[PDB]
Each structure stands twice: as structure tokens, then as C-alpha cells.
Amino acid sequence: SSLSTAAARNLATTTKTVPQMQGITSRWLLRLLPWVQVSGGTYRVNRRAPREYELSVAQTVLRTHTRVGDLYNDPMNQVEEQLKLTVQALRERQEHEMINNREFGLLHNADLKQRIPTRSGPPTPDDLDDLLATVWKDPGFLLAHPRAIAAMAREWSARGLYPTAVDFHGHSLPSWRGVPIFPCNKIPVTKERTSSILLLRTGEEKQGVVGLHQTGIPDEYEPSLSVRFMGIDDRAVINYLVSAYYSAAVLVPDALGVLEDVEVGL
């Protein structure tokens, strides 16, 4: 019964699948942020000396054995799958740097007048209204941690408020006064169980937060991402350099607002 079935499997093929990554998340900042093309890796912003923006690089070395690249290509190209997973990891760390970097990160490039605290510590609807009023000109969307979103929803339930869920493209999302709320785990949660909420206006024509990249680069794989052969070493390992160029820019101080010290709760 079982032995016969196993023996039969010995002459059959199993259905496998691409390696599955638990880490892969919904990189909402990359999808929502408009991307403006820069030349020479430099972008000038005339602010009321102009600020200079240099493209940062997220790069890594992909090492693949020569045997893997030669033999294991029958059902699917293993070097291509390794490249896809490498690009996915690159995009994840890009999303992390768009928020947490000390040079162009959103959490650190916010004007001191635009950062506001919470009156009591939980993210009450009053704090949401204050955050909305900070960026009062065409507010694009809110970005928060899942714990933060849970905390705001518990304040809504405690106050007897059921906010309408906006339908953004094919996705239904929570919203506050028409402003869609997007979850992002890259936003830090401190050991005191506190986080931050970001309200953004997006667009170059609206003087909002934009993303900076450079498409067209040579040896390009995906837009603004390039893969280059580096060589084979004495142990017969093929090395590839994969590089993605990216930056962020807030055109005017009022395009970004931060609600700070949000008590998400344990």
C-alpha cells in the first residue's frame, strides 16, 4: 500500500516550485513613490545653497558554482532564479533605506515643524487630524507599521467610529478621511513599544516626495539595476555584481509630516 506507492513514485516526477521567501513583503513605498530620472547621479533642488542629491547604491555579489550554471537548467534556470532572489533582497533593503537612512531617509529628512507628537500616546483620531492638517495640500497617503494600524483601529473601535475602506487599484485599504493607509514593517518599533506614522504628498509637479533613480544605464537588467560579470575564481565560482541606484528627495518641507511617539502597545 505505502511501499508500492513509494516504488511507483521512484518512477515519477514531483512538482516543485521556485524557492519561497518569507521575507518578501509589500514594498509600498517603492510602488507609490514617483520616480524621476536623473543624469550623472546628481539632482539639484532649489530650496528657500541648493541641496545636492547623489544616488546611493545597493549592490551585492552573486556567487554561483560553475556546475550549477552548467547542469541544473532542465526544469528552470537556477542562475536566473538566484538572480531573481538577489534582486528581491536588493529591493527589500532599498525599501528599508528609503525610510531608515540618515542621509535621504524619510524618517530623518522631515522638517522639525512637520514632526508632531501625540497628546496621550495612543494614535487617537485627534492626532490623525493634526497629522492631516500638517500636510493639508493634496495629502497622498499614510504609511504605518501593522502594529500602528492595529492601534489606530482600536482607537476607532473605542470611539464608535467605522472609517470607510478605500479601494486603491485592485486592493482594499484602510483610510482616514479619504487618505489610504499603507502598512510597512520597515518603520521601526522601539523597545518602549513606540513607532511613527508618515503622511506624504507625492509628485514632482505637486512639490512632493519623489524617488530618484537613473534608468538607461549600461548592462541593465531591471530599470536602474545592472548586473555585470566579474569573473571566475580558482574554485570555479562565477561572480556577478548586481547594482541598483536609488535616492529620495523631499522638494518642499510641507510635503512630509511625521506623527511621533505613537504607543502601539504590546
Residue numbers in the entry: 18 to 65, 252 to 469
Task: Provide the authors' own sentences about this structure as they appear in the paper.
Family 2, the most abundant class of encapsulins, is further subdivided into Family 2A and Family 2B based on the absence or presence, respectively, of a putative cyclic nucleotide binding domain (CBD) inserted into the E‐loop of the HK97 fold encapsulin shell protein. In this work, we report the characterization of a Family 2B two‐component encapsulin shell identified in Streptomyces lydicus (Sl). Through heterologous expression and purification studies, we show the differential assembly behavior of the two shell components – Sl‐Enc1 and Sl‐Enc2 – and demonstrate their ability to co‐assemble into mixed shells with variable shell composition.
Negative stain transmission electron microscopy (TEM) analysis of purified Sl‐Enc1 and Sl‐Enc2 highlighted that Sl‐Enc1 did not assemble into regular encapsulin nanocompartments. Rather, a broad smear is observed, suggesting that Sl‐Enc1 does not assemble into homogeneous protein shells, forming irregular aggregates instead. That is to say, the Sl‐Enc1 majority sample yielded a symmetry‐averaged Sl‐Enc1 shell map while the Sl‐Enc2 majority sample resulted in a symmetry‐averaged Sl‐Enc2 shell density. As Sl‐Enc1 cannot form shells on its own, the obtained symmetry‐averaged Sl‐Enc1 map has to be treated as artifactual. However, we were able to use this map to build an atomic model of the Sl‐Enc1 protomer. First, Sl‐Enc1 exhibits a clearly defined 23‐residue N‐arm, not present in the Sl‐Enc2 protomer. The second major difference between the Sl‐Enc1 and Sl‐Enc2 protomers is that their CBDs show different relative orientations with respect to the HK97‐domain with the Sl‐Enc1 CBD being tilted by ca. 23° compared to the Sl‐Enc2 CBD. Thus, Sl‐Enc1 protomers can exist in two different states, one with clearly resolved N‐arms – as also observed in the symmetry‐averaged consensus refinement – and one with completely unresolved N‐arms. The discernable N‐arm states result in substantial differences in the size and charge of the two‐fold pores. For example, slightly unfavorable angles between Sl‐Enc1 protomer‐protomer interfaces or the presence of too many defined N‐arms – only observed for Sl‐Enc1 – could potentially propagate if too many Sl‐Enc1s are present in a given shell, resulting in an inability to form a closed compartment and a propensity toward aggregation.
